[PDB]
Amino acid sequence: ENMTPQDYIGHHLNNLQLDLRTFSLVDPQNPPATFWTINIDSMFFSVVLGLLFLVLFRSVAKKATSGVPGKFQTAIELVIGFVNGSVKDMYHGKSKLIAPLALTIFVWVFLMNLMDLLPIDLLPYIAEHVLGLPALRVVPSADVNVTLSMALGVFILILFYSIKMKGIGGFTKELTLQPFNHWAFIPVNLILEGVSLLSKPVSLGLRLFGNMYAGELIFILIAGLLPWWSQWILNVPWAIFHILIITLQAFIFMVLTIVYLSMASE
Amino acid sequence: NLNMDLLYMAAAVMMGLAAIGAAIGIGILGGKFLEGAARQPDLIPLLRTQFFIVMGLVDAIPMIAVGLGLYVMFAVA
Amino acid sequence: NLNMDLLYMAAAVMMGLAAIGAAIGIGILGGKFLEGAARQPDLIPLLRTQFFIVMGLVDAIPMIAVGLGLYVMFAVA
Amino acid sequence: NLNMDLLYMAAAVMMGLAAIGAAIGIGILGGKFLEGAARQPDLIPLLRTQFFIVMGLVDAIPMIAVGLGLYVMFAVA
Amino acid sequence: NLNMDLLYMAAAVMMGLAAIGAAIGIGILGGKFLEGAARQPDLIPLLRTQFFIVMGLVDAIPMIAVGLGLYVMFAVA
Amino acid sequence: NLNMDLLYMAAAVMMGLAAIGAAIGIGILGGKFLEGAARQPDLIPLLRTQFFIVMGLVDAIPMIAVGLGLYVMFAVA
Amino acid sequence: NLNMDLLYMAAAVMMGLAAIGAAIGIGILGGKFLEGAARQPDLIPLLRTQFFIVMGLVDAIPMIAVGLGLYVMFAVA
Amino acid sequence: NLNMDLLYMAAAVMMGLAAIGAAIGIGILGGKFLEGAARQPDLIPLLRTQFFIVMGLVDAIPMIAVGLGLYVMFAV
Amino acid sequence: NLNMDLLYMAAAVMMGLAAIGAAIGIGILGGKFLEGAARQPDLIPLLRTQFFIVMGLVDAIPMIAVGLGLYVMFAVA
Amino acid sequence: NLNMDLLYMAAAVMMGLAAIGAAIGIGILGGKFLEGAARQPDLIPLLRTQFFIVMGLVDAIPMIAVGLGLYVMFAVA
Amino acid sequence: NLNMDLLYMAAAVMMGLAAIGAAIGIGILGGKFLEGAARQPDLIPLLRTQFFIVMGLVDAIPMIAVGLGLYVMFAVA
Amino acid sequence: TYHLDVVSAEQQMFSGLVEKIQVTGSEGELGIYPGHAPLLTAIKPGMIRIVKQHGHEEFIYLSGGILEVQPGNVTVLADTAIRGQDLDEARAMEAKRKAEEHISSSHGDVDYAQASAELAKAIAQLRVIELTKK
Amino acid sequence: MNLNATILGQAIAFVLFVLFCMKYVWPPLMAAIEKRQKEIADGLASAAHK
Amino acid sequence: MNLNATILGQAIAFVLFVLFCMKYVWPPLMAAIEKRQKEIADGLASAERAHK
């Protein structure tokens, strides 16, 4: 088997894609060029983890009793309390959206990051040999598209809340007049506040992507270059470090969503 | 030869400066977090919730730098 | 056509120096914010207001540096 | 030809060093403003008046570097 | 031949800048840890816990920088 | 020819270093000025008077640098 | 020329930036060790054990650079 | 030709690093001046005298660098 | 052949950077030694012992750098 | 002609780095002198004698650098 | 010919970095000495003794650098 | 110039206008000036130099207390203070004898916490008794 | 990277998961949990001295 | 490069990682759940003690 180190790394860095015009699972050796080459891995893994999240929480919601809580129910009400406590800290308006939005963001991004800890060859190997798919990678949040999808959704909610509460006059006043106040500085202020506004969602998406893609690349590099006896002793410390990374990146995406929507509305 | 060479050189400079920026900024910010934890320890769960907010802003820009670094290496080649 | 290869370098230096400036500026600003929080924790939502007001000015120039470097990397190159 | 390579690099060095200078200067000055605001709230508007006074002078020289970097990029090259 | 021989230089730049960033960031953070550890003994383990936690965030970017430098040496050059 | 390509670079480096120096110098000096007001405001005008007195010597050299940068860029060209 | 001399230059960069980082990080950390040792001179054994815990993390990431620089000089060049 | 633009580059390096030196050293010095002045008002003239005494020493080298920057630039 | 000049340049970089690190690290550490000893005029020998212990670590990497610089200049060149 | 055009850069590096070193070293030391002369102006002459003793140590090496820069620039040309 | 010419640049970098290291390190250490003397004037003859103990360790390496700079400039030239 | 008031629970040590003063502090000694920056602090065992009109000093022992500088008129509060000629060199030498015995006679930490204060009292007296000779 | 239809696919998934959480999950979870808290709060309010 | 050994090495890494997880990650979780059931058990008891 003529596996060079660079080629093993490359195949782990090759997405599985399908062109919607020919509607066929295309080969990674030669990549086609069109917007409609959906990344199969991203879609399937993201939607499956979201469904699992909803199924667990619903499996408690459709049964919950206000008596003595069980050992599983307690775990879900811990995270509910954690999310609601963080929302209650930073948002005081009445909106019913903010709290469930924070909940879904936290748990969904957590599970998506959790994919990164699994062994790099397991699911891709099963996908090629058992099924026959020509490529695979299993971390959804290690792809730009999903992270920008979430960031742009949060962007649209920021615009919705700013418009809704402030009205036509207030939002235009904040975009033009600040931070230099005088009407002589308005032409510069549109650029400064416009770029700040646009920076908020760009920051969200690229923070999450930059963490997760490079982490998966570290696992790929260890597996591809270094000999087995060193692969285990370098794989364990990176996993122990990346548990902290996955938790904090999910938490940061949640917290900054709350902060951005709070500053949009209040 | 030297077209593809210089792309990885550019990624090197980009990610190196980004590494300095993120590392030093969080070093300073977390040092102040620890000083505030040392003076009022039962107040840590609030200051930690402020630290993650500020730390998000600190890393936000080095991380688009890092993203374009790995873009230059793996996407442009 | 050699012209392309220097333009990634010229974008790299802009985004690297912008990352350094905009990371260390917010590090210094936010550390003082956290010590202010450690002294006066009932004031935190006031100092968060002032902190955002000042942080916009810290990120005035560096977000222009990132904007034009990100321009040079894609639009011009 | 040979012109645009170095002219973009010159503009990039100019605005990158400006992006260091403005960010660090406003970081230090704003950090002192925030400890002043935490130490003496209800003097926030007066201290903010003085903060903008000093901020105008702190950023005065860098603004020229930004202007001439934009000139070099979009007029000379 | 120059193409690979310069890639050693690119890796040198990247991982050296990463080394200085990580070292100084951890130095500042640990200095505040020790000062707190001298003031409050039962806070020695508590502050050491938070110290490890945020040291992860300090090293997150330099570790990927160093890994990519090693990748340049052993899988690009 | 090559002359103008290098001369714009020379003016760029000169004015960039001038910008960093002047901006950070006034940042520190005005930081102490703004600190004084947080202690108490009644010598804001007199500390602001000594502030201009010192800020002149701060701006002494960087405007020689800026003057020669402008000369190189517009007169040697 | 180009093969050997650039490898020594890369080694110089690696083991010089490692020197800056590993020296200044430990200077910053050990200064706080000595200040704590002067305030609480009965705690010096406990403080120095904390100091070695932190110092191990400070030095590790420069030690990668130092070892790999020796590798680049003797093993590669 | 190639000679003179490199002369301008060398002058740029000298007269930029002199700017850094003369800026930061007097920022550090004048900040201590302002705190001392904000604490001892009658001594503001006295402290200001000491300030110029030490300012001469701080400016000593950056002016050598600036004089040689102008020499490399214009006189050769 | 010309190659021998770059070896002096490489040792120059390596040893000058080691001088920066070994000077400033000990400067910071000794400053804290003196400051701590000034407030309480006792316990200096046990405290002085600690200064040598930590100073042993500060300069180790610079000592490796200086040794390799001497080796490059006199042995290799 | 070809020979002399690089000795002015050999002079430039020495005097730029020696200017930064001497200026900022004396800045730190003199800032401490003015602080101490603010607490006990009664000791202003005694501290002034200590300042002139220590400043001669501070700028010994930078003057070797400035002297050999002037030698190179005006005796080797 | 470059075997003569580059050696002055190679000594230039050595005696620039040695000067920055020695000047900043002694600036920090001597400033701590001056504040200690300002608050504890009875202890000046003791603090001065400790100052001269520590200062030779600060100068240990920069004088290696400056001695080899002189050697490279005049002996090998 | 300005007015200085020095008191202890046992007596008023001084009260009147003064030209300048040098006073002990918690970290180190400090010199006050007319219209100085207002401050308050605790004071370590030491003394105060009272340089009055026409430049005449007198030396007051301050074994412990607090100093106040908020107004132009300043104020010293002393837990224990002794006038500069009620004490004497023989008394400070007796304090030296006492402290040098107790240093040899203290062996734990709490008793050294007391012997250190006894030593500080002795040393502050041994200081003021020399300053008194000017 | 490669601008791709996956972004809009993930947007559909994101918005529908938020709507499902708003409709099915969140109201009943919070209702049950806070109803337990209410019972304990009245358990405080109930507490023969009076 | 031989590939079978790399998957074997990933298996060893996973085993050692599991032994870390069982002894530093799971017990905090079981502690949190057990202490929240302690808390609500105490709460329901201290609720029913109004009946007395």
Residue numbers in the entry:
A (entry chain a): 4 to 269
B (entry chain Q), C (entry chain L), D (entry chain J), E (entry chain I), F (entry chain M), G (entry chain P), ...: 3 to 79
H (entry chain R): 3 to 78
L (entry chain H): 3 to 136
M (entry chain X): 1 to 47, 50 to 52
N (entry chain Y): 1 to 52
What does the original paper state about this entry?
Masked 3D classification focusing on the central rotor highlighted sub-states in which the εCTD adopted either a condensed down conformation or an extended half-up conformation. The maps generated for each of these sub-states showed the position of the εCTD, with local resolution estimates of 4–5 Å. However, due to the likely high flexibility of this sample, it was still difficult to unequivocally assign the position of the membrane domain subunits (a, b, and c subunits) in the maps. To obtain clearer information in this region, a refinement that focused on the Fo motor was performed and produced maps of sufficient detail to enable fitting of the membrane region. The sub-states of State 2 showed the best detail for the two εCTD conformations and allowed the c subunits to be assigned to Fo rotational sub-states based on their interaction with the εNTD, assuming that the c-ring remains bound during rotation, which is likely because the interface between the ring and central rotor has a buried surface of ~1200 Å230. In the present study we observe that the Fo motor rotates two c subunit steps in the clockwise direction (when viewed from the membrane, i.e. the synthesis direction) when the εCTD transitions from the half-up to the down conformation. Torsional flexing of the central stalk facilitates the majority of this Fo rotation, while the peripheral stalk flexes to accommodate the remainder. When the εCTD is in the down conformation, the central stalk is no longer stabilized by the εCTH1:γ interaction, likely increasing its torsional freedom, and the εNTD rotates relative to the γ subunit. When the εCTD subunit is in the down conformation, εCTH1 can no longer bridge between the εNTD and the γ subunit, thereby enabling the complex to open up to an unclamped conformation and allow a greater degree of flexible coupling between the F1 and Fo motors. When εCTH1 is in the down state, the central stalk is no longer clamped and has increased flexibility.
